[PDB]
Write an enzyme that holds these catalytic residues in place. Structure first.
Site, PDB file in Angstrom:
ATOM      1  N   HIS A 191      39.090   0.104  54.744  1.00  0.00           N
ATOM      2  CA  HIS A 191      39.252   0.877  56.376  1.00  0.00           C
ATOM      3  C   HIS A 191      38.497   1.653  56.714  1.00  0.00           C
ATOM      4  CE1 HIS A 191      42.423   0.898  59.773  1.00  0.00           C
ATOM      5  NE2 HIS A 191      41.049   1.956  60.445  1.00  0.00           N
ATOM      6  N   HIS A 232      35.384   3.246  60.414  1.00  0.00           N
ATOM      7  CA  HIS A 232      35.489   3.048  61.465  1.00  0.00           C
ATOM      8  C   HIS A 232      33.469   3.501  61.934  1.00  0.00           C
ATOM      9  CE1 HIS A 232      38.919   2.121  63.646  1.00  0.00           C
ATOM     10  NE2 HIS A 232      39.140   2.702  62.657  1.00  0.00           N
ATOM     11  N   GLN A 238      40.426  -1.814  70.247  1.00  0.00           N
ATOM     12  CA  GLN A 238      40.747   0.157  71.043  1.00  0.00           C
ATOM     13  C   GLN A 238      41.374   0.480  71.725  1.00  0.00           C
ATOM     14  OE1 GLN A 238      40.371   3.450  69.156  1.00  0.00           O
ATOM     15  NE2 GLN A 238      41.751   3.014  69.555  1.00  0.00           N
ATOM     16  N   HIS A 258      45.545  -2.463  63.469  1.00  0.00           N
ATOM     17  CA  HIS A 258      46.056  -0.932  64.319  1.00  0.00           C
ATOM     18  C   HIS A 258      47.767  -0.968  64.219  1.00  0.00           C
ATOM     19  CE1 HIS A 258      42.027   0.238  63.686  1.00  0.00           C
ATOM     20  NE2 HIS A 258      42.755   1.411  63.034  1.00  0.00           N
ATOM     21  N   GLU A 281      50.805   2.934  64.047  1.00  0.00           N
ATOM     22  CA  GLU A 281      50.087   4.438  63.642  1.00  0.00           C
ATOM     23  C   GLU A 281      50.279   5.418  64.959  1.00  0.00           C
ATOM     24  OE1 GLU A 281      45.462   6.861  62.988  1.00  0.00           O
ATOM     25  OE2 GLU A 281      45.594   4.553  63.729  1.00  0.00           O
ATOM     26  N   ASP A 298      38.945   5.703  56.660  1.00  0.00           N
ATOM     27  CA  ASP A 298      39.524   5.567  57.930  1.00  0.00           C
ATOM     28  C   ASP A 298      38.192   6.271  58.780  1.00  0.00           C
ATOM     29  OD1 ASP A 298      42.050   6.392  59.903  1.00  0.00           O
ATOM     30  OD2 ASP A 298      40.429   4.684  60.223  1.00  0.00           O
TER      31      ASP A 298
HETATM   32 FE   LIG Z   1      41.367   2.716  62.387  1.00  0.00          FE
END
Ligand SMILES: [Fe+3]
Ligand SMILES: [Fe+3]
Lengths: 423, 423
Positions: free
Chosen positions: A58, A60, A153, A211, A214, A310
């Site tokens: 995971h 980005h 997102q 996701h 979170e 992450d």
């Molecule tokens: Fe993430």
């Protein structure tokens, strides 16, 4: 033209082992009764540990390497991070995304990572970062198998054409369908977004990585829908719930009920220690919760859980060198997996468990598998973790793709003495 | 015969600097307008950061290096750790303590640590570890100034002859008077033990360092007595409250009232990130508190706080390489000091603030001070912390006492490329 890895230690195995290579694959693995002599075409593990490559389940890559551009996040908060990212919008181009993604990918290659799953924001009508990442995926293939998650997102139902853009990302080649229920405007949109996510994954035969929850909200339980839908479709292996930090705040009775379903569903879980400890618990004064999902309990229950970095060097997390042993170190501490065996077995959280999360079909030191493996200059997982050792050699397809000559430390006492931090 | 450190970056200063050395001291510090050429007798910092040595304000050298002897702590709990330590009793001798203390001290020298404060358990009528440590202190003096805290681990009033043994330790030369109020049988013994501790410190003119409120009990407030007594005696600078993890669980109103006294008293605080995150919060199920004292708030209030490693490779903490940048990394994460400036200024927590805690009189890169300094191959504190850089050179009395040749990492892409983890 490597033919053999010699003097290798393997996790959970006694003694030394020889790994024979042929045509880019592992042909056989044989135990040694002593130390083997080096020779041409033999890579000497020197009684170090040999494991199948580290995995980054995971990250980005679309936002990596942007910290401080044009300004630094001074408060360190999520809110300010969002603002700092917005200030860099003029620099977000095709070439910019490729350059930054490649920079972090090189650090990952150096760190023995041969499998990476990157999320890419697809709440952008131009899909700029996604198009760039699809090219990066092809370019880095000789060194890293990169999976791309189409990550909506801004939500699927809560963003204009969110669902259409998510599907467009899949039609362009994204490997995994993403979602972010807790960010949707309402709980109902959150649940509905998951039905849409599963429908797309089945329509295109893709993996799923949500996701999920979170947030430090004890009422954020989208994870039960992720697991139930996976169980219903009989596709647990292809499904992952990332974060699930809300689980850190659930009451024990609900969590116990939920765990039965989590085990039955067979879905995967990703915890992101470095970022979770930093971004969770921000609405608490004191005491402050840790905010990482129930890693220890998942391991005790046989539920597959693993660790991701992450973010690397960006507005949401300014640190990092994309090092999985560092991620593991943080997770063992925050999750209180500090017994000797728990620490030693820790490597599983950044190797085998992550490979399962990525649904990898060619992973592990086993006959018939591609010769993809790394060598750590340590006696076992505990030792590698304690000393935060670098990757001595990274082998892919039977060829060395990275190597690190270890640092050499000397103290000058009555006589010079080499220090290796072993007792 | 070093005469100059050149091309040095200094925290909070712009540009490069030249540090002139004479007779083992810093004679002058001058700014450079560009890069200076290397030459005989010049140590080139190569635009790396130069700072006064790292400090270890809180460690237990009497218990270090004993993990796994004879058995490993498998649960990782405090309770099991106590049992594992008890199983090693037959090996606890004068020579054993010296050998283990020296092993960790060598790691500290390698890590640029020239000041160490070790606690030593004096709840032992034979004072075996203390006698050994007093010899170690003399032996390591050329490389590390070691302070010894007479630590009454089993209590002063709650252990047979506890007070007599504490005073005997001071008469033998211990530099600091310790205490552990929250471990005494009653709150009254806890308060009374502090009066006895302060009386001994004044009688012998010694420093004070209390294992203070190391417990997740919102009612453990011995810290207010430590601060009040220090204020009353006008000796804040000589007093330290270690841990104060209970403060993580106090209500905000009491904490606000208390902070006025903490600032007025001028006492020092030590947080031990690596151990605190591991041992605190063990009685919580979920959510789980972090358990570190109010570091961020202390910094905001101008209250001196710093970080210690506490334990290295023992039953209470199986990990560690005695590395202060690693301790700092954990603390910045758990305390959420993750803004750029907070991270960059982080070095203060393992340098200057710790020197103040040890009441050091010869510390800092300043004319007239002994030439004790270290060189980090990094641009600033943020960079050093992010990349967990080693200490390139450690200089003491104007002489190099340790050096680390950095690791060299290469990735083999279309062409070989060196990776230094900088962007
Ligand atoms: Fe993430
Ligand atoms: Fe201690």
């Amino acid at each position: 033209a490597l033919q053999t890895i010699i003097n290798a230690r393997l996790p959970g195995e006694e003694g030394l082992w020889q790994i024979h290579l042929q045509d880019g694959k592992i042909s056989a693995i044989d135990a040694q009764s002593g130390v083997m002599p080096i020779t041409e075409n033999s890579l000497d593990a020197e009684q170090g540990l040999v494991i199948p490559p580290f995995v980054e389940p995971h990250i980005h890559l679309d936002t990596t390497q942007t910290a401080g551009q044009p300004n630094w996040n001074q408060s360190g908060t999520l809110f300010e991070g969002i603002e700092r990212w917005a200030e860099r919008k003029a620099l977000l181009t095709h070439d910019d995304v490729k350059q930054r993604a490649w920079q972090t990918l090189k650090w990952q290659i150096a760190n023995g990572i041969q499998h990476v799953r990157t999320h890419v924001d697809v709440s952008d009508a131009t899909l700029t970062a996604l198009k760039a990442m699809l090219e990066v995926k092809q370019e880095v293939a000789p060194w890293i198998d990169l999976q791309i998650v189409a990550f909506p997102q801004e939500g699927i139902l809560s963003y204009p054409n969110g669902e259409a853009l998510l599907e467009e990302a899949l039609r362009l080649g994204a490997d995994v369908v993403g979602a972010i229920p807790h960010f949707e405007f309402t709980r109902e949109y959150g649940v509905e977004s998951l039905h849409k996510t599963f429908a797309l994954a089945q329509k295109y035969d893709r993996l799923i990585d949500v996701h999920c929850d979170e947030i430090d909200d004890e009422q954020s339980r989208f994870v039960e829908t992720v697991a139930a839908l996976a169980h219903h479709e009989g596709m647990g292996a292809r499904v992952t719930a990332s974060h699930t930090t809300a689980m850190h705040s659930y009451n024990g009775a609900y969590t116990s009920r939920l765990f039965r379903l989590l085990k039955m569903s067979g879905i995967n879980f990703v915890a992101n220690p470095l970022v979770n400890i930093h971004l969770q618990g921000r609405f608490d004064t004191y005491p402050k919760r840790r905010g990482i999902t129930r890693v220890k309990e998942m391991l005790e229950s046989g539920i597959n859980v693993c660790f991701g970095h992450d973010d690397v060097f960006d507005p949401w997390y300014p640190l990092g060198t994309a090092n999985m042993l560092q991620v593991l170190h943080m997770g063992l501490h925050v999750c209180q997996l500090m017994g000797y065996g728990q620490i030693n077995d820790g490597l599983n959280l950044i190797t085998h468990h992550s490979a399962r999360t990525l649904n990898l079909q060619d992973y592990g030191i086993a006959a018939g598998n591609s010769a993809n493996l790394i060598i750590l200059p340590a006696e076992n997982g505990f030792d590698a973790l304690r000393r935060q050792v670098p990757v001595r050699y990274s082998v892919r397809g039977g060829k060395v793709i990275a190597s690190t000559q270890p640092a050499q430390t000397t103290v000058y006492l009555e006589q010079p003495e080499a220090i290796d931090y072993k007792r």
